[PDB]
Amino acid sequence: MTIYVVTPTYARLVQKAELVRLSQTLSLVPRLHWLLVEDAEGPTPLVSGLLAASGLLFTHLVVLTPHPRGVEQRNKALDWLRGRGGAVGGEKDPPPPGTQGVVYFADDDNTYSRELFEEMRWTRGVSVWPVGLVGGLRFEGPQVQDGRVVGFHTAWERPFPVDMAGFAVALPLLLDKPNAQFDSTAPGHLESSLLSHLVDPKDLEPRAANCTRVLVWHTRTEKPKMKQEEQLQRQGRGSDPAIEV
Amino acid sequence: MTIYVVTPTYARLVQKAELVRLSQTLSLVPRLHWLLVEDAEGPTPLVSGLLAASGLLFTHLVVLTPWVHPRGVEQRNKALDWLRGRGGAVGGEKDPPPPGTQGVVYFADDDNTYSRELFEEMRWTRGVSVWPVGLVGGLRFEGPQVQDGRVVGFHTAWEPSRPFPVDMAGFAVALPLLLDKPNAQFDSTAPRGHLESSLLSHLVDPKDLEPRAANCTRVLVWHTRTEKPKMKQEEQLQRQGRGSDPAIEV
Ligand SMILES: O=C(O)[C@H]1O[C@H](OP(=O)(O)OP(=O)(O)OC[C@H]2O[C@@H](n3ccc(=O)[nH]c3=O)[C@H](O)[C@@H]2O)[C@H](O)[C@@H](O)[C@@H]1O
Ligand SMILES: O=C(O)[C@H]1O[C@H](OP(=O)(O)OP(=O)(O)OC[C@H]2O[C@@H](n3ccc(=O)[nH]c3=O)[C@H](O)[C@@H]2O)[C@H](O)[C@@H](O)[C@@H]1O
Ligand SMILES: [Mn+2]
Numbered sequence A: 001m002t003i004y005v006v007t008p009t010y011a012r013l014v015q016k017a018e019l020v021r022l023s024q025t026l027s028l029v030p031r032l033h034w035l036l037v038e039d040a041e042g043p044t045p046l047v048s049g050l051l052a053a054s055g056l057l058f059t060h061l062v063v064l065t066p067h068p069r070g071v072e073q074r075n076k077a078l079d080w081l082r083g084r085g086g087a088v089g090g091e092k093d094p095p096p097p098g099t100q101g102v103v104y105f106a107d108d109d110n111t112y113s114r115e116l117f118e119e120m121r122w123t124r125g126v127s128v129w130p131v132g133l134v135g136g137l138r139f140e141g142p143q144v145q146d147g148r149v150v151g152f153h154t155a156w157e158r159p160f161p162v163d164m165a166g167f168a169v170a171l172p173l174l175l176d177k178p179n180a181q182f183d184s185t186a187p188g189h190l191e192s193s194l195l196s197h198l199v200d201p202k203d204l205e206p207r208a209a210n211c212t213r214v215l216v217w218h219t220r221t222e223k224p225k226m227k228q229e230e231q232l233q234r235q236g237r238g239s240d241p242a243i244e245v
Numbered sequence B: 001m002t003i004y005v006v007t008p009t010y011a012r013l014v015q016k017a018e019l020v021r022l023s024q025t026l027s028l029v030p031r032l033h034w035l036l037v038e039d040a041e042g043p044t045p046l047v048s049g050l051l052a053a054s055g056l057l058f059t060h061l062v063v064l065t066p067w068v069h070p071r072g073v074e075q076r077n078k079a080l081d082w083l084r085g086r087g088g089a090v091g092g093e094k095d096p097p098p099p100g101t102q103g104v105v106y107f108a109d110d111d112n113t114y115s116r117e118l119f120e121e122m123r124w125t126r127g128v129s130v131w132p133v134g135l136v137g138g139l140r141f142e143g144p145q146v147q148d149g150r151v152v153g154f155h156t157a158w159e160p161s162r163p164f165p166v167d168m169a170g171f172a173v174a175l176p177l178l179l180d181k182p183n184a185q186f187d188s189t190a191p192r193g194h195l196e197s198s199l200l201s202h203l204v205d206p207k208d209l210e211p212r213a214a215n216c217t218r219v220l221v222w223h224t225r226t227e228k229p230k231m232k233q234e235e236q237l238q239r240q241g242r243g244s245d246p247a248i249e250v
């Protein structure tokens, strides 16, 4: 079972760092295909280079978003999976029709345990699991009773009150529902805008030992202070722009 | 050449997430021994468990941190004490390499980002090696200026008085050198920013620094920091008696 990891990314100071640790984590997972989609005007040498040197099975996609982020990027990754092309690097050919697999939307700053991926390979339709440090809670996750989702441990308002990092979708189910995609105009409702097109919340498949284990965390990275850089810039002694960071 | 990675760590909401990605990055490096030092009263089930399941070669150490607010000093000096034969292991490999062993010591904080490439750069260190660190000291990257394969200055701005204006993540030290310099340790009384110099000054002169990472033109490590999680809702849910299940480790 191949896991297709859809990751939207964009240029900012910590981008490479984020992509370095994420790709390093992904290199630990077998049968994984990374669909990295840049939110840019064109492919950046930084991303293209990072990908070429990652040694991972990947497909490079690009699409600019002129409010929810990473939407147009994730939707383009979906278009590719549905055979509508759009690849600028890596494996240009999408999985053939009727190919088995599972799609997982992994943002570039979260922390993913390697165990997480083994949990989602068995996804029939859509599976769910708790996500740590998100929604203002220690963890947010499905309430399970006798192996069935009977509710959700959440504090914010949503038929699918789960974070992007808390679910995976079987590839066949996404191909069967050609219209299923994220709504770029959807506010906490991004995840639902996709899932509503696929399953009923009561049919979600709980993983992570019936949602008793946190295997992914919604970590965020601090924005680096650049006061000293600006100062050195004024003196014409800024950090060499030819040295990538 | 085995790399001994010294990492001080303490319990806080993001701790496990940090140790997870770090341990996952380290599992990518061969001949690496992780010296994970907990800032605690004793080994914690969280860290002990993570280490056991990591599959890494490690030694679990523990020491509590007793104005400038130096961080991880006691923990780092504890890993040094262990390397110097003073014991203190609570798990993993109990015995340190015997004198004469070839290796390199690297002080990796638990929140930075490390490319697997960085470790091959430091594996060959005779005395003290150096390279640029990204997003630290208020710069895109802070690092040594290299001319003719030798360090001839530093690209830095913050606390320029530092004889070694380089972040903890920007250098590595030869194990034999550390054992040969028993007094070499981190100074808890040093000004904010002079922590690195407090150790290195007992080991070498900046001119003898070994520039790595293509003569310090490649940034292979970043001083990333993780945002403290917002817990307003958790606080509210607790009062109602429905706080996040405490039996689920995060
Ligand atoms: O507001 C939102 O739409 C996002 O809110 C939260 O995530 P959060 O950590 O707040 O947001 P980011 O980490 O900044 O962005 C999520 C993903 O979109 C990407 N992104 C962000 C910003 C941007 O301008 N372009 C872009 O592609 C990021 O690289 C990342 O992979 C959810 O976990 C995301 O799934 C959701 O997309
Ligand atoms: O002020 C300092 O002493 C630190 O400043 C910067 O790092 P920074 O990212 O600001 O600090 P932290 O990441 O919070 O701490 C560095 C290490 O010490 C550990 N630490 C921190 C705080 C604490 O109470 N206990 C403890 O073990 C952290 O887990 C981490 O591995 C430098 O990169 C660190 O080497 C230096 O120790
Ligand atoms: Mn995020």
Ligand SMILES: [Mn+2]
Pocket (backbone or CB within 6 Å): B109, B110, B111, B112, B223, B224, B225
């Ligand atoms: Mn740090």
